[model samples]
Target: NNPLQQQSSQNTVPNVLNQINQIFSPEEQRSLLQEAIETCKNFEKTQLGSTMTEPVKQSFIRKYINQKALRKIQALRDVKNNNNANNNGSNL
Candidate 1:
């Protein structure tokens, strides 16, 4: 059977602009997700408020923009880039 029929397939595309505009011709939503991941990284411990501090210690907010996130962003970027390159006469 086709695998995209599974539940996890939805997040794989990461579409953000579609929420605001049906005509969203924006590129991969990984850019927006990566921005969210980066914003999650910059939140200071003091900003979390005392009660929620300890619980969020091991959360993604503490260290979300690691190499993996970079690779995810890169994977999305590479798709469009490679397509453009192929159209412009280049090979990878």
Candidate 2:
């Protein structure tokens, strides 16, 4: 018997609003949304990192906070860490 997903199919990932309108169906997208919200909520509560202050107005968050996105977005500045002692100069 399947555990994590009782049934898997070729259904396309729903658009943000349409997915929210479901209001039913125990689907993968729903769980994705719930989990992402929880993660953002926790991240906001702590002062160590990015605060969720201007969330709505923040373009990065406006798209990312969709909660149902299946893509990953990495910070461009991450390249700063890619350089080894012999690779490049320093971060800005």
Candidate 3:
């Protein structure tokens, strides 16, 4: 008995688009939006099983975008910190 049978499938593109619009700016939407969609597709292909639910996929996409944004913020902070370190070294 295949438990995976009869699992309702739903399109995730619209949900992904809505989330992207809500989280990213217009400029980011142009490029990052497409990348996010590709990432979601790849993620589903690899990480999630064939019978994954729509809500679960949506949540993963949201989390993935959040992590991507957070990494950018962290990168900016690292640059600032590196500059501060250089300034301190120069003064010493």
List per-prediction Cα lDDT, in the order shown. 0.43, 0.45, 0.59
Q: Rank the candidates by lDDT, best first.
A: 3, 2, 1
- The sequence of per-residue lDDT tens digits that candidate 3 reaches over residues 1-92 is 65752322233323443544444687985676578778889877777657867788668766777677655544545543332122234444
Q: Pick the candidate with the highest TM-score.
A: 3
Model 2 error, position 55 (Å):
6.6
lDDT tens digits by residue: candidate 1, 6-92: 222233434422332322224533464567555655665436534544446445532443434444544655454332122355568
Steric clash pairs (candidate 1): none
Candidate 2, 1-92: lDDT as tens digits: 65672322334554544533332355755665566666656656664365345554244343554432322212222354432123447798
User: Candidate 2 local accuracy as lDDT?
Assistant: 0.45
Lowest-lDDT window of 10 residues in candidate 1?
16-25
The TM-score that candidate 2 achieves is 0.28
Locate the minimum summed-lDDT window of 10 residues in model 3: 80-89
Which candidate's lDDT is highest?
3
